[PDB]
Amino acid sequence: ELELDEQQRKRLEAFLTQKQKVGELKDDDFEKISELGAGNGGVVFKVSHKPSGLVMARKLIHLEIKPAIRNQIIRELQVLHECNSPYIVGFYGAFYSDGEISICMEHMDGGSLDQVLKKAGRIPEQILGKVSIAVIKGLTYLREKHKIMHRDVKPSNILVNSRGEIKLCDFGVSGQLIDSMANSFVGTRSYMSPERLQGTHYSVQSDIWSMGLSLVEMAVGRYPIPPPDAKELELMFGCPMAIFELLDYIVNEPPPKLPSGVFSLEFQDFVNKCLIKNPAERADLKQLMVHAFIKRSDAEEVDFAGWLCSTIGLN
Numbered sequence: 265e266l267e268l269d270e271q272q273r274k275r276l277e278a279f280l281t282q283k284q285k286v287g288e289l290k291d292d293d294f295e296k297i298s299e300l301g302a303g304n305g306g307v308v309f310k311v312s313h314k315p316s317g318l319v320m321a322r323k324l325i326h327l328e329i330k331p332a333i334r335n336q337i338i339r340e341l342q343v344l345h346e347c348n349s350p351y352i353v354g355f356y357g358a359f360y361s362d363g364e365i366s367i368c369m370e371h372m373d374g375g376s377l378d379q380v381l382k383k384a385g386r387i388p389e390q391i392l393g394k395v396s397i398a399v400i401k402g403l404t405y406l407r408e409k410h411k412i413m414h415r416d417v418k419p420s421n422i423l424v425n426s427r428g429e430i431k432l433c434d435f436g437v438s439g440q441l442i443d444s445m446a447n448s449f450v451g452t453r454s455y456m457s458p459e460r461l462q463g464t465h466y467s468v469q470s471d472i473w474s475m476g477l478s479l480v481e482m483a484v485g486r487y488p489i490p491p492p493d494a495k496e497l498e499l500m501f502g503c504p505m506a507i508f509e510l511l512d513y514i515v516n517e518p519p520p521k522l523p524s525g526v527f528s529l530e531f532q533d534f535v536n537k538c539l540i541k542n543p544a545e546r547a548d549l550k551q552l553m554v555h556a557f558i559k560r561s562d563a564e565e566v567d568f569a570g571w572l573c574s575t576i577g578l579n
């Protein structure tokens with residue numbers, strides 16, 4: 265499940281070789297091209313690293329903290345130089361400058377799945393199969409090689425590109441950057457598992473809930489809680505709640521589900537196994553990797569890049 269084919273081995277080797285040419289990252293070496301997002305307490309820009317000529321994505325986190333603090337964060341973000349996977353966004357480096365931490369990463373031309381969703385309206389089942397594989401393999405990589413979980417799976421944290429690659433970004437790597445960002449805002453809690461919202465027992469099972477929740481949103485074209493009325497489905501397939509009320513609904517109500525007679529039973533089953541409220545009964549990475557929907561999605565050779573380019577008008 266963590267074994268790479270020839271094309272993925274080659275792409276990973278070409279990225280590291282290219283990264284080795286980049287030295288110490290410095291503020292003045294960057295030229296802004298455009299803006300990309302802001303979903304996790306910062307701002308993302310498409311930038312040009314002037315000396316190397318490489319196009320990167322630069323996350324700027326505005327924090328006003330004593331020299332001692334920032335230096336620890338930066339040492340802790342060095343963990344990311346070890347995160348080498350076709351399912352994790354490439355990391356170039358991190359530094360502090362004029363009151364802000366910069367995280368420099370690989371630029372994904374397809375953007376994030378929240379953006380792809382907005383354009384598309386809804387994402388087809390076969391495309392969601394490819395997304396599911398990448399999320400499971402990404403979470404398996406994080407857990408296997410670095411003994412860490414994502415903690416923030418959601419559509420905006422899944423990045424796509426014109427080469428048909430799907431990658432995860434924005435996973436807790438620096439304990440200090442987390443602690444120094446307390447009282448929030450570090451991102452919405454609307455994708456959190458019932459167990460995390462109860463302050464109870466939390467593992468990679470919480471990430472599986474988030475994935476399951478994100479898949480239903482992308483398949484239907486709407487954030488799924490509260491479930492849609494019989495009339496809202498007739499609009500969609502022919503065939504407002506305040507955050508505190510919403511978080512209560514997740515803990516207290518039955519989990520969302522895909523509408524029937526629209527999606528395959530294998531896909532409906534797969535999301536249901538991710539969305540079981542009790543994390544013990546809920547499926548795990550090993551179980552998900554051999555699920556009928558995953559095996560069928562793997563054997564399906566889906567032109568993800570072709571679908572992507574047509575949908576967002578890339579080219």
Ligand SMILES: COC(=O)c1c[nH]c2ncccc12
Nearest residue numbers: 300321369370371372375433
């Ligand atoms: C937090 O990381 C990001 O948002 C991104 C990292 N690379 C990207 N490429 C395009 C859009 C967003 C990003």
Ligand code: NA
Nearest residue numbers: 303304420434
């Ligand atoms: Na993000």
